[PDB]
Design a binder for this molecule. Structure first.
Ligand SMILES: CSc1ccccc1CN1C[C@H](C(N)=O)CCC1=O
Ligand SMILES: [Zn+2]
Length: 140
């Protein structure tokens, strides 16, 4: 689990969104495994606006923060899971690292801010849903 709090927005994995998130829905995309809902209180996170390929991510199944190199956001085939059938997931970035289903929500961050959140894993790889193209998160 995990979320990003920026301005009056809450960014979570679409598969982990609550009844309140759907009731206060701003934007969602099943093909990205992302959902944004509105909040009453102001958040303190800053979204990165960059093309960085190195950062650090939190892995809850290891209680550790790992430095990693990661790929550019792309359309990647993702095997069937408890929450989605087999499909292509868009805006996804991979790194060599550990990831288990309950690790979804873990933040990936570079020197500029939050880059994305853990969304996929398996085979010694970890995948992150990019949020750097969602420019509207910085305004209104
Ligand atoms: C070894 S499977 C694994 C590992 C780490 C994380 C996630 C998974 C499988 N998964 C992928 C889904 C998706 N984004 O398409 C989201 C929910 C889920 O459980
Ligand atoms: Zn950056």
């Amino acid at each position: 689990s995990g979320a990003i709090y920026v301005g009056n927005y809450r960014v979570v994995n679409r598969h982990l969104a609550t009844h309140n998130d759907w009731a206060n829905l701003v934007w969602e995309d099943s093909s990205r495994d992302l959902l944004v809902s509105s909040t009453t209180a102001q958040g303190c996170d800053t979204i990165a606006r960059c093309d960085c390929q190195t950062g650090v991510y939190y892995c809850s199944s290891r209680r550790k923060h790992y430095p990693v190199s990661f790929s550019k956001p792309s359309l990647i085939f993702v095997e069937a899971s408890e929450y989605y059938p087999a499909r292509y997931q868009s805006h996804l970035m991979l790194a060599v690292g550990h990831s288990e289903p309950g690790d979804c929500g873990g933040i990936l961050r570079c020197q500029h801010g939050v880059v994305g959140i853990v969304s996929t894993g398996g085979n010694g790889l970890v995948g992150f849903a990019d949020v750097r193209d969602l420019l509207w998160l910085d305004e209104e």
